[PDB]
Each structure stands twice: as structure tokens, then as C-alpha cells.
Design a protein around this ligand. Structure first.
Ligand SMILES: [Mg+2]
Ligand SMILES: [Mg+2]
Ligand SMILES: [Mg+2]
Ligand SMILES: [Mg+2]
Ligand SMILES: [Zn+2]
Ligand SMILES: [Zn+2]
Lengths: 36, 137, 100, 65, 205, 49, 91
RNA sequence: ACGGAAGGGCACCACCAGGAGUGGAGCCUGCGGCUUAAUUUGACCAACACGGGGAAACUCACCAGGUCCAGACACAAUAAGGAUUGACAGAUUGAGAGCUCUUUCUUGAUUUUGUGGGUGGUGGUGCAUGGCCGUUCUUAGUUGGUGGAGUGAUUUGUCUGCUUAAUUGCGAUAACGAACGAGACCUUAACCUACUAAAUAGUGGUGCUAGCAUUUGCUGGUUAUCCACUUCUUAGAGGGACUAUCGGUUUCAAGCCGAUGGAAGUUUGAGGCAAUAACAGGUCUGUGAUGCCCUUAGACGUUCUGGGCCGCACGCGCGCUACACUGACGGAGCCAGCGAGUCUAACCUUGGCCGAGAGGUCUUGGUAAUCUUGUGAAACUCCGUCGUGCUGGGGAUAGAGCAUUGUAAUUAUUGCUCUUCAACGAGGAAUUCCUAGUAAGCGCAAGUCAUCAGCUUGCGUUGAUUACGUCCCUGCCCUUUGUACACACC
């Protein structure tokens, strides 16, 4: 029952393969991106 | 000069050559055949024809392939066939026939190999003819 | 000239013997020295199975057989004869391995 | 790319053979999941351009006109 | 090893035979001959008509070769296919079974098809044919019909020597139909192996 | 989505029908005992005795 | 106690041939003078070592997790030995 | 078809003469029953060590739970500045599972939602089917063409007699000439001082060469050390038996009975193959064989964890081990055959070393007539201890420890050591198999197999007694006969 809330209309880290589209999610001390 | 004897699967190859009465079965003397009860089965092809009878022939056997009793019978047939073959090849046909007479008249498969072989086993029961125990209810 | 050994393996006895006689004939026609074709005994690849595809009926068993006969023939020949003898025996059904 | 590799192999080579192992991670020739290959040619089935035969769980696919 | 190698060669032959039975059914496929040569392995497809197996100037035979090589992990060029028209294809039990199955599938009376294949086999030199159609030949009782012409032996080595049998499953709207085709070729026109029945004695004066 | 299948009846299957039971693994056939009966003549196994 | 007294070198053959971290987080995250909150598990093949002593484990025997307190005499035994997988038959 | 009808023949799935037993004991295994969450299920001579069914996971089909779509393809609405995909960290969960949530990142028309329409199903139906197998039926039986007999179903051919294992033949003859089955055939096991050919088989004469004995012998060694050969071995092409010869008996013959010769005289022994008709025999759980029905996204698909299939008042079938001295136990002697084995890799393992053992470790040979392996098997033989007592017979049950296989041994996988040492004193009524290298005893290899034999398929070792008949029992084949049977005496 994964709904994927629409996530309506809208940093940087290591592993430079991320092409400036790897904005991290800031909940608390969350240094981990969507890719990894 | 070279002869062989078989009973079921044991083959005994005997070499009969010119020598002085030396009877070996596996490198040991014929007094050492070691069934300890069928040792006279291997003496039988000697005591029938002539007890010593021999300062002229040497018999050296080698037997493999069967069991204790089968090997005993194989060597006892092999040395008899070797003596018959030696007398036919070297000494004379008259003597060969004359001691073949004693061997075959007392025959315990001394000269003719026994044709009895293990009959193949069939499914549905252990052994060639014995069947598994049948039940009805 | 080189030492060679030809190993022939097959289930078809007639094809195997035909190829072996062809090799022997091609050796004797050039008067080479060869150790005669030695017949490695038939491996009977027996397989026993149950006739029924289920578990009903009299327990009838069934044996299938696959007879693998082998021959080996080693001789001496130059590279030309070696290549022509490996390229003369392509009878269908016989596996041929030539070793130096 | 996921279907692009499969289509490229299918066209360039001409045919495809896929063992019926829906959990084999690496197809023998195509660098893709075996399940991906099987489902891609299943999409490419009688909807158009491919004929498939099974023949002991090996999924022989061939291209059509 | 060698025992495993020969067993695997037989398994490979069975794989090829069933693959071509499934693929070349419409082509009148009869049987593969596998001939391993030091340079290459050649598989000859024996078919009644060997133009559809070739296709458009070798398109179909080329794609079959590519499929076989890709499946059996051969090297490009190492395996090659061929295709041979079967001589007197009325004596091939597999071919006759395939033809009768095709007739029953496209729609035709069971008796008509069975007697057609029987007549064709008998007129193409055979000393006997038997077509057995088992299954729901009518509504729900699934009887078995036999259609035989000429002679037919059942017991012994001559059954392996000269008897050809083929079994096919026909898929119509009510169950499966089992077709069995048995052809006894004339031993006189054998061209290989024994040329007469074991009990046949021919005397000359 | 997978647990080890390196041995036992789940490691191998019939090369023809993919069945895990009644498998013949002698000489590496890996063929079910029924499929082997169906296509034993093709492999080269015959009945003589 | 145990045979004289990790703690596997003084143990039988099977346990040394074989050689839940939340058990401690359920141990200390509760007031003392009572038993820890149960920790449920399917791993009946887990050996009880002298570190899970005093805890409460719900062992799965196929259904209806069975509540067992770990005692010092249970050491060297499998976790499944205390969760019976069948019902007594009463014959 | 059947008959407690008659004639003839037959069969150790019948008996007679007997052997080994089974039924009694403990245990193993399958079945029923009971129980259970589930104890998956099919099968009741021709089910019950059967489904190659020796299930820890898998297998699995059952149960308690948790994921995923591996729902092709066609149409619309979500959507071409986002339909959807995935997510680390915590709640939830056995689960380090993004299952769902706290949560905001990530990817990109690859999929989501309705609609059809597919796909999968060890779901159901074997009483809708194919195929296969089993059985009727181990027997000798079955069929048409033309002719003959019948109004006809049908019949004759296909049979009085004799003979054969045989509808095998001699014959007879409203049948004649044919087909299938039987036989013939093929495989194998017997022999062949005949041919071909062999450091992948072997044997001798010289070499090299340890021992014992010294007129030169005996047994040993010499896997690239010499030559010769093929008796043993191997396997190709063949030979050989055809009841030969000789007697007797045979209605005229088919045949039969003895003896000799022969390797072999019973179809030479054993198989494989094996007709026409059938069964509502079994198998939809072998199959990507399958019709129909059911199910198909909280799945009856598939996968993951755990459990079960093994669970125990009881009954039954196949078996293993015994009840002992024709023995147990210790040494010592030290004889097979059929087979299998790893190049993407861990298989068969020799040898050395360590360990009481199981086993561990370091190498080695072998893809194999080459090495494991001469598979130095067991029963057996010899010499000793035991001394007839539940004994030193028997080894169930149980406790403790040591290992091995496996991701995982708990409900002990198995092996090993010590200890406990049950029933069982030859088994009721009943009942099975078997005629010569057979019964029986004995072990071995293969199959299943990661591990697990008390199972099976084969193999060889030791090797009887009894019979060479009969139709009494149980059945079978042919004929005659009776029937009020035809689902055919259930
Ligand atoms: Mg016959
Ligand atoms: Mg009649
Ligand atoms: Mg069971
Ligand atoms: Mg009555
Ligand atoms: Zn990144
Ligand atoms: Zn199969």
C-alpha cells in the first residue's frame, strides 16, 4: 500500500557521479541522499 | 606348457616346465594351499596318476578371481590340465591318454571346467528366482 | 616424424571398426610402424528405472544400455601423414582424439 | 536503456535464447536481468515482430518482418 | 570424461530433435543427423520439403543456425546447418504423423485422414502401415480407432530393424487426440542392415 | 527473494520438464525418470536384456 | 552454573561447531525488579549463550509465539527446545 | 461368461517332497486410525521400502504468518514542467524488509487506475482425455480374402487322435491359400592351445637387482630396463549344437526315452521384444500433453521465515536384528564380481603425518582396462577365550562426551567412545517364495545422495535338502455339455 504522495512542484555530497540533482533530505543529521 | 582352470570366476594359470618336481600354487608349496580341509582336493590330481612320479616336471600356478573353494578347484583343475598338456606335447599321446583315463574316470572337474555360472538376478525379488514376500490384505 | 596415438570412441561398432581398419590400411599402405588397435572394453552405461510414470502396478523395472566401445592405435608418421590421417576418418558417430 | 539493450541485441544479432530462470541475475550474452529479457520479448510477442518457442525451457525468440 | 561426454552428445541430439520437431512441424521435419567434424559440427535437417527450412535465400536456415549456436554455446562458424529432402518421404513415420496431425487440426474427418496416410504409406513401397487415433473421436467416451493395411510385425529385433513409429498429440476443442503411425518398410529395399525377415528362407536351384 | 538452493532436490531439476522429483543424475543426464523413458532412444540408451 | 563456571570453548561439540542484539535494548529499556519485555523471534536454531540470561523471548513454533524466560540452566540448548511445535496427543 | 459338470492338457504368483521362512519379539519403513494449526496427497491378486516417496531448508503440494507480479497486449484518465520506481535512519516486523508509517529525497512515460483480454496454478475432474504403465494373460491365443453352412446373430477355416513350451507340428479335413502372436530374432553366460592385436591386459629369457640357499636353484624387485609370445585378460571377424551318433519306443509320423561323444543336449542357461480384444485399473502430483470447471493481486501464481509431512490408546503389510556352541568374542589367515568418479572444480581418493575412534591435515593418481582398486568385501578358514546360565546370546531404550555434512542437526541427520543392557528361550490360527550354481546365508557397487539404508536395481562369495510328479487346493488353456447369467455367479 505504497501511495507515493504526489510530492508537488519544487545540496552536494561525495560520490561525484551525482549531477547536481542529489539534494539531501533534512530531517535531522540526515547526510544521506536519495541516490544512496 | 601353459594351462588354466576355472570353477566360477577364479582362474588359475599353471606353467608346467622341465624341472625337478616343484609344485607351487601362489609362490608357496602345494602343502600350503590353506583351506586346511580341501588341501586334498589339490593333491588329488597328483595322488591319482603317480605319487611322486616326477623328477622331470615343475608346476607353478597363479590363481585369482573367485573365492577360496573356487580357487582350490581352479588350481586342482589347472595342474591336471597342465600335466595332460605336457604329456601330450612332449612325452607321448599314449601316456597322455592313459592318465587322462584316470583323471576322467575319477573326474571332479579335473579336466573339464564346470559350466555352472551365476544366473542373473531379476527384479521383483532378491536372487534369480526367489521373489519378494507377497501379501493380499 | 612424431609419435602419435589415435583414440576412437563410439557406440556404433560397425563405424568404429570401419574407421580402425581405415587407419590400419593407411598405415600399412605407407609401411609405417604401429602398435595394433587395442580394444578398450565396452563400457555398458546401464540405467535402471521404473516403467510406470506413477506408483501403481507390479513393480516392473527396466534397464537401458549404452555401449561405449573404445579403440586406440599409436604409430609414427610425419606431420603430413598425421594431418591426412586425422582428416581421412570423419565417419559419423566415432569420436577421434589424436595425441602426440 | 533497460529495454534498449534488449532491443539492440535482438536486432543486431537477429535471434535470442533465454533460459527459463526468472531469478538468474545475468543473461548469458545480454547484460541485463534474465527476467527483463523474458518480459521484453514477451512484450515483443504476437503483438508484433517476434516468434517464440519453448523447447526445454529456453525461449527461442526470432524476429519477423 | 568420455562416458559423460557421449551421454551429453545423446542429450544434445535429443534437444536438437525436439527443438526441430517443435519449430519445423509445418516444414515436414523428419529427423536430424549430427556429424561432428574436427573443423565444425554439421546438423542436417531431413525434411520432406526443404525450401521452407531454407526460407528467403537461407534466411530461415541462418536464423535456425544462429538459435542453435546461441543456445548450445558454440563458436560463430563452429556449427552449421543443412537441409535434405527425404528420399521416399512416404516411409517416414514422423512425417506421416505430422501430416495427419495437421489435417486433423485444420479440420478433416478422422477416418479420412487415417486412411489417406495409410494409402500414401502403402503406395510408397511400404509392406504395412497402422494408424491409431485414440481419444474423444466422438462426444465423451474417447474410443480408439485402428486403420491398418498390409502386414505388420510386433515382436523381436526386426521391430527395431524395420519398423518406424511416431506419436503426436493433436489439440482440438475437446481434449487431446493421440495419433500413432507405424510403418513397416520393405526389408528387400533396406539398403542397410539385414535385407530379409529372420524366418525368410530364399532357395536357389 | 531467494534462499540457498546449492544442494538437495531444489538445487537441480529435469532439463526437459523442470521437475524436482524422480530425477536421473547418472552420467549427468539430469533428466526426469519419465522424460528419460520418453526420449531414451534419442540419447542412445537401448534395451537388450 | 555451567561446566566449571566467549563462553563457547567450554561447551559441547555442536555449539562450538556452529561457531538478537535488541535483547539488551529490551533489557535495559525497562525498570528493574521485573522481567524484560518479550522479544519475539522465529530463530528456533539459536543457541542460548550466557548473555541472554534473564530475558523473555517469544519463540515461534509455527504459530502463537510461546513465552519463555531464559534461565541459567538453559545454556547450551536450542531456543526451539522450549517452544513445542505440536500439541500433545492424549492417547 | 459361469458351473459344488464331464473330458484332455498345464502352473512352486498351485499343491505334492522339502528348504528358507513370514505371522510371535525389539527396531526400521509404508498404510489405516487417532491426534493436530497442519499432521499434504494418490493408491485398498493387479494398494500398504509403491508414486523411483531414504521430506531439517528446498523438494511441498499442508499449516501460522510476511513480500512481489514474473496481470502480455488493446482502449481511456492519471500524464509529456512528473504516470510511476527506489530509498538509508528510526516506529512496525522473525527479518539488516522501506511491508506500512515518522520523512523528504531519488528516478523517469519503462508504469498506475478502470476495461476487456491474457498468464500462472503439485487447484478439481484419470468417470472428459493423450501418452505411458499395470493387469486380464505367461498363457497360446487372434484375424480377415475367396469358398462352404446358416432367414440370422454367427459358424467353418482356427479340427478327431497323437505330439510340443507353444494354434509347435504330424496329420485329418468344406475348405484353400494367408496375416499377427509362438517360434524365428536380438542381448547376455558358458568353449575356441583356431585368426587379428595389445607399459591402459598379461606371461616368460635376458639385463639391474635385496634375501635364503651357493653347482646355481626358490621367492621376491626393477611403471620408459632388455627381447619374444598371446595360455590367462580384452574385443573384433568367425567357428561351434543341429537334440549329433547309436539303440529303444513310436498307430505310417511329428516326437519321446536312455547311453556315448561334446564346453554346452531343459527351447543349452537368463533375459529383451512380444498379438487381437479389453479395464471406466493407475497416473491431470513427470511433462511448456491437455479439454472443461475454479482461482488469478488479502492469489489456489510465486517467493521468504517458522512449523508439519516423523506427531501415538491401537490394528495391518514389506523388512532389519536375534533368540546362540553348526555360536559370540579376540587375534591370525586375506578370496570376488557388477560398477562410479572433478576442468569451472571440488568427484573417487592412494601415500605420509596426527588422533583411541569417528575424523583431521599435507600431498598424490585418475576425465579412467592407466588411479582410487587386486575395491586385502562379508559369510568363510585357523588358533585361542568363553561353557550353557537371558551368559561373554540379543542390542532395544536412555545418559554423557567427541566429530562429520549442511545457512541451519532442537523432534536426537549420521559416525565415534564409555555407560544403561528391554523384549526375545525358535513364535497360535494362518501364510509367502522357491527346482541348481537355484534356495538359503554373505557382503559389495549403483540409484536416490550436501548428510542419511534396515529400500531397491544389479553383482559376485559360500552353496543344500527335496521333486523330475499331479490336478487334491488355488487358478489357467482347449473341447463337450447345461443355464432362467450378459452389470455375465460378487
Ligand atoms: Mg519371441
Ligand atoms: Mg472360430
Ligand atoms: Mg510419509
Ligand atoms: Mg450367489
Ligand atoms: Zn550519489
Ligand atoms: Zn522430466
Amino acid at each position: 500500500k505504497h501511495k507515493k504522495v504526489k510530492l508537488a512542484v519544487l545540496r552536494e555530497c561525495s560520490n561525484p557521479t551525482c549531477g547536481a540533482g542529489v539534494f539531501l533530505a533534512n530531517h535531522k543529521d540526515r547526510l544521506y541522499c536519495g541516490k544512496c | 606348457v601353459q594351462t588354466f582352470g576355472k570353477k566360477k570366476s577364479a582362474t588359475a594359470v599353471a606353467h608346467v616346465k622341465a624341472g625337478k618336481g616343484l609344485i607351487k600354487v601362489n609362490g608357496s608349496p602345494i602343502t600350503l594351499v590353506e583351506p586346511e580341509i580341501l588341501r586334498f582336493k589339490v593333491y588329488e590330481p597328483l595322488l591319482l596318476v603317480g605319487l611322486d612320479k616326477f623328477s622331470n616336471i615343475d608346476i607353478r600356478v597363479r590363481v585369482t578371481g573367485g573365492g577360496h573353494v573356487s580357487q582350490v578347484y581352479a588350481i586342482r583343475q589347472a595342474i591336471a590340465k597342465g600335466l595332460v598338456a605336457y604329456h601330450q606335447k612332449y612325452v607321448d599321446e599314449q601316456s597322455k591318454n592313459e592318465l587322462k583315463k584316470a583323471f576322467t574316470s575319477y573326474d571332479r572337474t579335473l579336466l573339464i571346467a564346470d559350466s555352472r555360472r551365476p544366473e542373473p538376478k531379476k527384479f521383483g525379488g532378491k536372487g534369480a528366482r526367489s521373489r519378494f514376500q507377497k501379501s493380499y490384505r | 616424424i612424431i609419435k602419435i596415438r589415435i583414440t576412437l570412441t563410439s557406440t556404433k561398432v560397425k563405424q568404429l571398426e570401419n574407421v580402425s581398419s581405415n587407419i590400419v590400411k593407411n598405415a600399412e599402405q605407407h609401411n609405417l610402424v604401429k602398435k595394433g588397435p587395442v580394444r578398450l572394453p565396452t563400457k555398458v552405461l546401464k540405467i535402471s528405472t521404473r516403467k510406470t510414470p506413477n506408483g501403481e502396478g507390479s513393480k516392473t523395472w527396466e534397464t537401458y544400455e549404452m555401449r561405449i566401445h573404445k579403440r586406440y592405435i599409436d604409430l609414427e608418421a610425419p606431420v603430413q601423414i598425421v594431418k591426412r590421417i586425422t582428416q581421412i576418418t570423419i565417419e559419423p558417430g566415432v569420436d577421434v582424439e589424436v595425441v602426440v | 536503456e533497460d529495454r534498449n539493450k534488449i532491443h539492440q541485441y535482438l536486432f543486431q544479432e537477429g535471434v535470442v535464447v533465454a533460459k527459463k530462470d526468472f531469478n538468474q541475475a545475468k543473461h548469458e550474452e545480454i547484460d541485463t536481468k534474465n527476467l527483463y529479457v523474458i518480459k521484453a520479448l514477451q512484450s515483443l510477442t504476437s503483438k508484433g515482430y517476434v516468434k517464440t518457442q519453448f523447447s526445454w525451457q529456453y525461449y527461442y525468440y526470432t524476429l519477423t518482418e | 570424461s568420455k562416458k559423460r561426454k557421449l551421454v551429453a552428445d545423446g542429450v544434445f541430439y535429443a534437444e536438437l530433435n525436439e527443438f526441430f520437431t517443435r519449430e519445423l512441424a509445418e516444414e515436414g521435419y523428419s529427423g536430424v543427423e549430427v556429424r561432428v567434424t574436427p573443423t565444425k559440427t554439421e546438423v542436417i535437417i531431413r525434411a520432406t520439403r526443404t525450401q521452407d527450412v531454407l526460407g528467403e535465400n537461407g534466411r530461415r536456415i541462418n536464423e535456425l543456425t544462429l538459435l542453435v549456436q546461441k543456445r548450445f554455446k558454440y563458436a560463430p562458424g563452429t556449427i552449421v546447418l543443412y537441409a535434405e529432402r527425404v528420399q521416399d518421404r512416404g516411409l517416414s513415420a514422423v512425417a506421416q504423423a505430422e501430416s495427419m496431425k495437421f489435417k486433423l487440426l485444420n479440420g478433416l474427418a478422422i477416418r479420412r485422414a487415417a486412411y489417406g496416410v495409410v494409402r500414401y504409406v502403402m503406395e510408397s513401397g511400404a509392406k504395412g502401415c497402422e494408424v491409431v487415433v485414440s481419444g474423444k473421436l466422438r462426444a465423451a467416451r474417447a474410443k480408439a480407432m485402428k486403420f491398418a493395411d498390409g502386414f505388420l510385425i510386433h515382436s523381436g529385433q526386426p521391430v527395431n530393424d524395420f519398423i518406424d513409429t511416431a506419436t503426436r498429440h493433436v489439440l482440438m476443442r475437446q481434449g487431446v487426440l493421440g495419433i500413432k503411425v507405424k510403418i513397416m518398410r520393405d526389408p528387400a529395399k533396406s539398403r542397410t542392415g539385414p535385407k530379409a525377415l529372420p524366418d525368410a528362407v530364399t532357395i536357389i536351384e | 527473494f531467494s534462499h540457498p538452493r546449492r544442494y538437495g532436490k531444489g538445487s537441480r531439476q529435469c532439463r526437459v520438464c523442470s521437475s524436482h522429483t524422480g530425477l536421473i543424475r547418472k552420467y549427468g543426464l539430469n533428466i526426469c525418470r519419465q522424460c528419460f523413458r520418453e526420449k531414451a532412444n534419442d540419447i542412445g540408451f537401448n534395451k537388450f536384456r | 552454573s555451567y561446566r566449571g563456571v566467549d563462553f563457547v570453548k567450554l561447551a559441547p561439540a555442536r555449539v562450538r561447531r556452529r561457531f538478537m542484539k535488541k535483547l539488551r535494548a529490551a533489557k535495559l529499556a525497562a525498570p528493574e525488579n521485573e522481567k524484560p519485555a518479550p522479544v519475539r523471534t522465529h530463530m528456533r536454531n539459536m543457541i542460548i549463550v550466557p548473555e541472554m540470561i534473564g530475558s523473555v523471548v517469544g519463540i515461534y513454533n509455527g504459530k502463537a509465539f510461546n513465552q519463555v524466560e531464559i534461565r541459567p540452566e538453559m545454556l547450551g540448548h536450542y531456543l526451539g527446545e522450549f517452544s513445542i511445535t505440536y500439541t500433545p496427543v492424549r492417547h
